[PDB]
Amino acid sequence: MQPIILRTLSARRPVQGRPNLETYTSEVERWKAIAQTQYALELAKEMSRPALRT
Amino acid sequence: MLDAVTKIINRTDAEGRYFASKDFDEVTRFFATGEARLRAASTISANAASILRESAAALFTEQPDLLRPGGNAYTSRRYAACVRDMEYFLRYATYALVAGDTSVIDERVLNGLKETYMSLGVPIPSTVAGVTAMKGVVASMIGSEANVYFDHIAKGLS
Numbered sequence: 001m002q003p004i005i006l007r008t009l010s011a012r013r014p015v016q017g018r019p020n021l022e023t024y025t026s027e028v029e030r031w032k033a034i035a036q037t038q039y040a041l042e043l044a045k046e047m048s049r050p051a052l053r054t
Numbered sequence: 055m056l057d058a059v060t061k062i063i064n065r066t067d068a069e070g071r072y073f074a075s076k077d078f079d080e081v082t083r084f085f086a087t088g089e090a091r092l093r094a095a096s097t098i099s100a101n102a103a104s105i106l107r108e109s110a111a112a113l114f115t116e117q118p119d120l121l122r123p124g125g126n127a128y129t130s131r132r133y134a135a136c137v138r139d140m141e142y143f144l145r146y147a148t149y150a151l152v153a154g155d156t157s158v159i160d161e162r163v164l165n166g167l168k169e170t171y172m173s174l175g176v177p178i179p180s181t182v183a184g185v186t187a188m189k190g191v192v193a194s195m196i197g198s199e200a201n202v203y204f205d206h207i208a209k210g211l212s
């Protein structure tokens with residue numbers, strides 16, 4: 001058995017840990033706020049109706 | 055206004071007699087509870103803003119139509135007058151709790167309040183519901199010690 005066969009090649013990924021996601025989390029919170037506004041607008045439209053006219 | 059001791063004094067004076075054993079017993083009973091009543095009053099005073107906040111929250115959660123246009127609590131001015139009334143009720147209930155007598159509520163709170171509310175169109179049952187919500191908040195906070203005074207305000211409106 002004399003062919004050179006390579007068994008354990010190192011991977012592409014680096015050894016470091018996961019970079020933090022604070023800026024991504026902030027932008028996601030911005031999207032959440034935008035999405036909450038579009039439902040809050042409808043419910044607010046509901047809030048401004050007259051009192052006893054059912 | 056009167057407190058408990060002055061009320062007992064007036065009771066013994068209407069009969070033109072000196073204090074007897076029962077009168078001294080009643081006055082002693084009032085003095086014994088004074089520390090607890092002062093603690094309750096201080097506790098209410100420390101959190102008056104939060105009591106008022108959650109009392110108005112309870113009132114307007116029960117009856118949302120008051121806040122809606124055409125409701126008696128729809129404007130900044132009328133909402134403010136409503137929460138100011140509730141703040142009055144809490145402060146004067148605290149005064150009465152300290153005094154041990156409800157005459158402060160008669161002199162300073164119910165002196166034309168029911169007539170005022172009937173004249174202005176303020177809904178009295180809704181106001182009593184708000185007073186009752188504040189009574190429940192204060193009771194959960196300090197105990198039953200103040201219930202009667204809030205009921206007094208309710209009876210002054212009902």
Ligand SMILES: CCC1=C(C)/C(=C/C2=NC(=C\c3[nH]c(/C=C4\NC(=O)[C@H](C)[C@H]4CC)c(C)c3CCC(=O)O)/C(CCC(=O)O)=C2C)NC1=O
Nearest residue numbers: 120126127132135136139142162163174176177180181184
């Ligand atoms: C210190 C003793 C004292 C008390 C007790 C008092 C109560 C009081 N509340 C009033 C009006 C009012 N009171 C209320 C509160 C009502 N709104 C309803 O939705 C609720 C159910 C309810 C309260 C829980 C409102 C909205 C007004 C305004 C009435 C109007 O402008 O048409 C008024 C007429 C004058 C004014 O608005 O300033 C008085 C005198 N004022 C005092 O000086």
